[PDB]
Design a protein around this ligand. Sequence first.
Ligand SMILES: [Cl-]
Ligand SMILES: [Cl-]
Ligand SMILES: [Cl-]
Ligand SMILES: [Cl-]
Ligand SMILES: [Cl-]
Ligand SMILES: [Cl-]
Ligand code: NA
Lengths: 16, 16, 16, 16, 16, 16, 16, 16, 16, 16, 16, 16
Amino acid sequence: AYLLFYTEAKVAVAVK
Amino acid sequence: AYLLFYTEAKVAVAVK
Amino acid sequence: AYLLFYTEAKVAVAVK
Amino acid sequence: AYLLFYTEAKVAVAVK
Amino acid sequence: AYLLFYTEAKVAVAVK
Amino acid sequence: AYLLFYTEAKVAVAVK
Amino acid sequence: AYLLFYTEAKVAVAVK
Amino acid sequence: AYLLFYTEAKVAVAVK
Amino acid sequence: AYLLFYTEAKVAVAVK
Amino acid sequence: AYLLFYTEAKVAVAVK
Amino acid sequence: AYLLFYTEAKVAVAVK
Amino acid sequence: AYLLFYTEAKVAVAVK
Ligand SMILES: [Cl-]
Ligand SMILES: [Cl-]
Ligand SMILES: [Cl-]
Ligand SMILES: [Cl-]
Ligand SMILES: [Cl-]
Ligand SMILES: [Cl-]
Ligand code: NA
């Protein structure tokens, strides 16, 4: 898996 | 803010 | 676990 | 020049 | 935003 | 500018 | 040797 | 302080 | 492929 | 191979 | 081993 | 400052 960044704006991180 | 890694095992990432 | 940059395009962080 | 990781998502390397 | 490694020790990733 | 990666196979680097 | 970021949390740089 | 990669070539770490 | 910081001296980014 | 940087004028990156 | 950033003030680096 | 790597054998790190 890798770290997925996404914008909420502010940066947030998910794991895929 | 900074990236906080934490284990649930698997690593998860929060933004503090 | 290791935090390893990679690219197959942009870069991502793998969790190993 | 600095090599600065950033994200707007994947990561990219800015050159400053 | 930039992803900047930093230390005050341990190392952390700042989001700026 | 930032470093752009592309497939040429081997990874190759350009600048945008 | 590689310089590999890792986390067990903050991060650290492994020498492999 | 930030740990910033840079290049003048190989790379290097600046402590700012 | 992975982008791995590497040194034997200065640091380089290995493509693996 | 390694990422080879050169500062020519914008930075340029070769794969050696 | 791992790189240890510590205080001596100035930061210092030990290969632990 | 910047991190200087030199071999004394084992590699030593100095902050210059
Ligand atoms: Cl934890
Ligand atoms: Cl805190
Ligand atoms: Cl680990
Ligand atoms: Cl900054
Ligand atoms: Cl520009
Ligand atoms: Cl410097
Ligand atoms: Na969310």
